[PDB]
């Protein structure tokens, strides 16, 4: 089997660092992408940003100046951070994950299993 | 994801499978303008050292800029440069260079459309008129020439530093410069144009995770100096079809094992290189040149690709199949040489030539009979023929051996055509048709000889 | 980027009647690489993360249940559930990953 | 000015016309000369990182005349390197170095004659061995070694530079290198240098115009690094014809347009590549590489031109006048290809492949039939077949189509030769006469079975 | 020593002599390693402009290990690296990189034996690593963050710059580099490597002698970026066999004399180019690109020769012999063509064309006949064929014109063959007596119109 | 019809900088080359350097160190300076113009309308 586990505070003062840390068990991260969707309660899921099989990253336009994910393929771990949190991007964050270069990749398949994040002081 | 390479000694020909390719099918053209400055007057008098040699880098500037010009004056500096040239032509149109500045003002990046009615971004690499204008140029305006910080010196080194690798490398060039370099266009640069590309996601991963075969694949063309703005077109490449199934056949000549000199007649599939699925039919790329290799992914360039119908596949497997016509050559020299494929080798041993297959710790392990064999790329790390050694390569994965009655045995050495460099198998088949009936007109002589 | 416009909101319904939800994309969603089209159908459980129910809006994920299959081309998909249950109250979202990633409303069940 | 290409369909040809060319006929040699210090010893005692810095910089200046010394043992390193390896031997006897040293001791630029009998200029581009002595060389005599200023270190550097990235380009490319860098000749005193030649203004004024293409042909022969004198060859080019005119010939496939295959042959004049006018004859040059195109003004080099009679100018109007015996090639592959000519584009459809035209707001514009077919270059921009894509150049000029009944036509397949390379229009007309007394024999062999 | 050139005018072929050689038969790799530092982190809080400027050399550090990481990323990056890719794959391996990384603590070279079972010695070039940690680091840890003076910031560019220089070749080469830059392994570290490696002390005396070549032939395979440490394959060339004799041979053109064209038949031997002893038999090289050639040794390399037996030599002096069966063209077209030859050179002159030998100072001095005919390197400086010139090079040793009847007369045209890319004597003999054998039955049937 | 105008100063002190400017109407200076011939009084013609089409230059030998001709095409403008004048250089300036590479068209068939330059304090 695979499975996702999420580590981090999720309580965080207004306009400050948040950092997760999502360590990866069942596969290798030299091959699954990792992606990063964020549901705010009550509303659906927003995507913010990706991070491929070769290190490089795609954000969020919206984040892209705040939003940082990086990847470490040694110990299977993948990391991000966001700055400048403000009281709007209280959420639930899944560092869910990715296939190939193909649709048959199951999508967003294996999800974690969601860290609460409440933005407040 | 698996590479099983399949040798078939009915051809003896090596044919991969498994491959994941990605054919280039556009390209897309991003305006890298340099903010420079139009300073040519020196006023401040100062004999300083550290002044002569802020002086001297104004002066390379300043030789730079000609250079430019110069190159501007070589502008327009297929399928290549065009839409370079077009997007050079249209910034020498009134006002275009003034949108693209007015545009880039606010951010270092932006997407402008242009009076051709192509929108393309802009990216402003280096923003020199700034650096200039606000810190060198006022201490070269007052007559004092005042530099008591020789850091900047350098620090406008380093400024200037790019630029003159941008001219230098366009110098020799004549303003097309490939590869591009990490000074036309910076790595970081380039990962973050690709996310701002117009594309799939599929796009950006694929050329996100291999980003050197697309500086390898870059064009970088000489635009314009003009109204205090350089800008060249980075031309990048553009993957419509990605992780298609795409397989390389490797062929080596098959001659008769014939001890007597004179009768080898060799015959060499030439539909040799790199065959790749998209919108239903074979890209083929005859030259090894076009199509990079990574570790499974066979990027190409359809720039000189053919388009062919599926069934040429079945002519891999299958060499007198209806549906497919493959292509083949008939010589006569009959020279013992090797192939190292994925998988394995190739060896073509004939006449007196001693071939041999060899181990880093067994030492030689194998000896080669005549006639065209294949040897597994485990356990076998060299051979040598003759007096030449080919390594064999020690690439993972699984290797088939198909028993296969050589297609040469079959045609007669007699009547075998000689040097044809590109044939077919209908083809081959109508000239041995010509050539028997040439034979049977002959024996229609001796009959009417014999009666008459 | 692609909108997605899911309806209806809500759709309340009773055990063992049929649910049908429509999706439309903003453009189309088909691929001219591998002649596929890029959405996919997601089922959330209150309290539970999203489960990957259908991509291509036709290929179930594997251990799902055969009630949901739904259909579509172009730019109008349907998610069809043949037997609700009364455990399959859920939120149901579609979504599209060929331009960028984003997602619909939220197709709301609720049994009676 | 105006070019005029005249595309006929009888050939399916497409020639370029109105280009003023500018032959290149033979070369001048420069003796570029840098000023060295014969320095090897230290005296200097510092450990100040300063110091470290300008006894690193000396070691890497040592270390590059030691490479220097090196390609020099490589030394002597058609008409390519002869000038230079002269006036590298002649460098090597007594005395000639000497006498360049003691003439440009006033002077950056000087014509010196040699014992060969030949005068050339002498460049003394770079003063290094003033710099070293009067400035570095007191700083390492004195016991005290205090290197003054920070600037004298970076102006040592920067001089240095130039030196050393002339060894690093000479021994990756083992003393000779081309194109001539800015670092083996800057552009300024190139420009500097074309003034002294002895030519005429024409060729001024010519070289001035162009200094790209005089970089592409140029060359820069290492010779001889002795008696503080790093001396190399550069040997830059001299146009004896200016304003010549030069015509581009492209050609394609021309096929039969039947369905069936085995019976398309292909016919596709092998003369194809540029043709000047000199001295009342033609200089044809086949390949491509070595004619640059500039702005209608097309520059050439005449070591791999073929001199030619002028009648083979009726040959691009006429193929089967009698003057010139144009050449072909006859092959039987009717692959659908396009080549991209100057004011459009020739494309060749044949079989069952696709070949479209198109402009980028009107979309798809036009569908090709069988044979060879012209396109300009206005109101359409791109032409896709099968499954590649290719451009038309964005020229302006006047283009002119002429109907033409294809040559394929009057060529009976039966009889039409195959595989054929460079052929010509009376070598393919009796071998097909042969082939007919082939069949005219014949027809006395049932004439045979006839008559007995 | 003496070059002994002999131009058969038979086939009017040169033949140089007295050659020198130093073949290339094997490859050692030497595992060339960078020390790197693993720093991520600033925490400097300085905004002077020397800290800004260390700040940015540190980034350009760090982009140029992000860069290596991806080229790690397109390893593994046909015996040129087959050898060299297999110690990537090696230092892959758990413990493979930390058992170099301690032996070479004490010792900047070390011989490391690896898992393979192969020991390979390992050159540390550049330790980073110990002046990033020592000097620049302890400044970055502190708060204050004071560069002692620019002349730190200096260094540290100087420093930086050779792996800045070697991540661009790398990035632009996609890893695989050469000829081996300056950059990849300075000239004294590579004759240190030389001395170190394991070879016959001829091997040392011939590779210390000419480095140039070495380079040339070297290579540069990127293996690996991990765990502080940045390790290439430098694998240079590795010369089995030094001072055999070889010889090269230069052929021209030989075709009628009959000024009515289309009766020209000619023949040119196409087994020109480059021969040298080895065990006993010849490696021949078909192409003189890789026989690089000193003054009098000419270096080669076998990864693309061919073995022959001995007895090919007697076919230079005797193309008749039953011992070997020599390779020649027959071909149609007679340009008239020149060939530059070490001591002179071979001038093919047929129809209309004109062909004059000329001396610097005496002028025009002697008009070609038809025919190929030799003229040697002194008395003679230049030779003007049409439009087109080329030299003679002024090389010193004798030279011997031989009489020679030309073997073309030997041959009928009528029955002649036309464009063989490689034929053989026996081969044009064989067809010869097919067509006397098809012209004797056609005989035949003229006489049975007779007979009855 | 085609012209030049010549202006700036002819009248300046001897061993200073003396400048004009000839401003071309009725053609392109990207292809008409422009000379600038000298006449002192009682004395034919001598030649003062030229500027190509390109913008390269090629000075006469003798004024090669302190001749200087520039020109630019946007505004189709010729500017000449010399440096040391001396009263040896009193004389009649013309910005007479060129024509091709192939010589077949008015070598210097337009000339200015001439400017006096007397040299003296």
Same mark, same amino acid.
């Not at chain 2, 007052?142 to 850091?151: A, F, L, R, W």
């Not at chain 2, 005859?286 to 040149?289: D, G, I, N, V």
């Given at each position: 089997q695979v499975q996702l586990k999420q580590s981090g505070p999720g309580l965080v003062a207004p306009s400050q660092s948040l950092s997760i840390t999502c360590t990866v068990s069942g596969f290798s991260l030299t091959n699954y992408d990792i992606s990063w969707i964020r549901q705010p309660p009550g509303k659906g899921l927003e995507w913010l940003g990706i991070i491929w099989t070769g290190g490089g990253t795609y954000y969020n336009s919206a984040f892209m100046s705040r939003l940082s994910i990086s990847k470490d393929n040694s110990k299977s771990q993948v990391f991000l951070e966001m700055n400048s @949190?403000?009281?709007?991007?209280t959420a639930i964050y899944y560092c869910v994950r990715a296939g190939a270069?193909?649709?048959?990749?199951?999508? @967003?398949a294996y999800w974690g299993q969601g860290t609460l994040v409440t933005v407040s002081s | 994801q698996n590479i099983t390479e399949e040798f078939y000694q009915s051809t003896c020909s090596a044919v991969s499978k498994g491959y994941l390719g990605a054919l280039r099918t556009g390209w897309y053209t991003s305006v890298i303008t340099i903010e420079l400055s139009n300073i040519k007057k020196n006023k401040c008098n100062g004999t300083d050292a550290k002044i002569k040699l802020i002086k001297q880098e104004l002066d390379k500037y300043k030789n730079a800029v000609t250079d430019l010009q110069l190159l501007m004056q070589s502008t327009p500096a297929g399928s290549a440069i065009c839409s370079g040239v077009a997007v050079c032509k249209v910034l020498h149109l009134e006002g275009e260079v003034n949108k693209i500045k007015s545009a880039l003002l606010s951010t270092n990046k932006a997407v402008v459309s242009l009076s051709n009615g192509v929108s393309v971004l802009t990216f402003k690499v280096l923003d020199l008129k700034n650096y200039i204008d606000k810190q060198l140029l006022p201490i070269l305006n007052?007559?004092?020439?005042?530099?008591?910080?020789?850091?900047t010196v350098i620090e406008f080194q380093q400024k200037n530093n790019r630029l003159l690798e941008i001219t230098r490398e366009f110098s020799v060039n004549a303003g097309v410069t490939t590869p591009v370099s990490t000074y036309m266009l910076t790595n970081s640069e380039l990962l973050s144009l690709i996310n701002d590309m117009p594309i799939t996601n599929d796009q950006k991963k694929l050329m996100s995770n291999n980003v050197q075969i697309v500086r390898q694949q870059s064009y970088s063309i000489m635009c314009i100096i003009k109204e205090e703005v350089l800008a060249y077109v980075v031309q990048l490449p553009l993957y419509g079809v990605i992780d298609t199934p795409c397989w390389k056949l490797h062929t080596s000549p098959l001659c008769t094992t014939?001890?007597?000199?004179?009768?080898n007649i060799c015959l060499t599939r030439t539909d040799r290189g790199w065959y790749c699925d998209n919108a239903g039919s074979v890209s083929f790329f005859?030259?090894?040149?076009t199509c990079k290799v990574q570790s499974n992914r066979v990027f190409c360039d359809t720039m000189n690709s053919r388009t062919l119908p599926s069934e040429v596949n079945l002519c891999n497997v299958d060499?007198?199949?209806?549906?497919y016509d493959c292509k083949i050559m008939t010589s006569k020299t009959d020279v013992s040489s090797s192939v190292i494929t994925s998988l394995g080798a190739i060896v073509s041993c004939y006449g007196k030539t001693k071939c041999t297959a060899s181990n880093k710790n067994r030492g030689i392990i194998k000896t080669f009979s005549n006639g065209c064999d294949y040897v597994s790329n485990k356990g076998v790390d060299t051979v040598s023929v003759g007096n030449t050694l080919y390594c064999v390569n020690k690439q993972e994965g699984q290797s088939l051996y198909v028993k296969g009655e050589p297609i040469?045995?079959?045609?007669?050495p007699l009547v075998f055509p000689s040097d044809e460099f590109d044939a077919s198998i209908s083809q081959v088949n109508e000239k041995i048709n010509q050539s028997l009936a040439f034979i049977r007109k002959s024996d229609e002589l001796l009959s009417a000889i014999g009666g008459y | 980027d692609i909108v997605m416009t899911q309806s209806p909101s809500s759709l309340a319904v009773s055990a063992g009647e049929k649910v049908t939800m429509s999706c439309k994309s903003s453009?189309?969603?088909?691929?001219?690489?591998?002649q596929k089209n890029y959405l996919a159908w997601y089922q959330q459980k209150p309290g539970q993360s999203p489960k990957l129910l259908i991509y291509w809006a036709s290929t179930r994920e594997s251990?799902?249940?055969?009630?949901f299959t739904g259909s579509g081309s172009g730019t109008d998909f349907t998610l069809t559930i043949s037997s609700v249950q009364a455990e399959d109250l859920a939120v149901y979202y579609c979504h599209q990953y060929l331009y960028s990633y984003t997602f619909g409303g939220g197709t709301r069940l609720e049994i009676k």
């Open positions: @949190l403000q009281t709007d991007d270069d193909y649709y048959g990749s199951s999508p @967003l | 007052k007559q004092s020439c005042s530099i008591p910080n020789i850091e014939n001890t007597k000199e004179g009768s005859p030259q090894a040149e060499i007198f199949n209806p549906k040469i045995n079959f045609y007669d | 453009q189309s969603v088909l691929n001219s690489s591998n251990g799902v249940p055969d009630r």
